[PDB]
Amino acid sequence: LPDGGRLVVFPNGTRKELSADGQTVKVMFFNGDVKHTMPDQRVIYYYAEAQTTHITYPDGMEVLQFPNNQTEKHFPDGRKEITFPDQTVKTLHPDGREESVLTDGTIIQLNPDGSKVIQFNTGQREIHTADFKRREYPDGTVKTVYSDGRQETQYPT
């Protein structure tokens, strides 16, 4: 405001601040909601009841922030990236793939076909397929347990 701005106060308590050049407008509604339009054309919406912030960008990107500290990025291509309060990051793809990265480095990938791949904190991987669950071990063996219950151990060369 101090530098050439304008402040508008409505009788109901809604306030609107406009920059001198008009490129920044902030509306603080009577119910606590806020709409803040920036010069870069991003628009920030705060919803007071839900305590949620939604940022929209001109390229279609959207960011959501929730009061439990969860944050999300919604990319124009349909990708969603969620950072949970425990700092796990989960990426969801339009084709149904989901990948979660835990703070200890564990990666959990769920594939569109229902298969699952885990890379443990140890760097060893385990896959769950329709026909078997298979796991790598640090001694160089690979163990496969098939759907019929048989267990196969392949030893390293």
TrEMBL record:
Centromere protein J C-terminal domain location: 58-90, 94-128, 133-157
Localization annotation: Cytoplasm, Cytoskeleton, Microtubule organizing center, Centrosome, Centriole
Assembly with partners or alone: Forms homodimers. Associates with microtubules plus ends; binds to beta-tubulin subunits exposed on microtubule outer surface at its distal tip; also associates with microtubule lattice. Associated with the gamma-tubulin complex. Interacts with the head domain of EPB41. Interacts with LYST. Interacts with CEP152 (via C-terminus). Interacts with STIL. Forms a complex with STIL and SASS6.
Family: Belongs to the TCP10 family.
Protein name as catalogued: Centrosomal P4.1-associated protein
Species, as recorded: Danio rerio (Zebrafish)
Shown stretch of the complete protein: 950 to 1106 of 1124
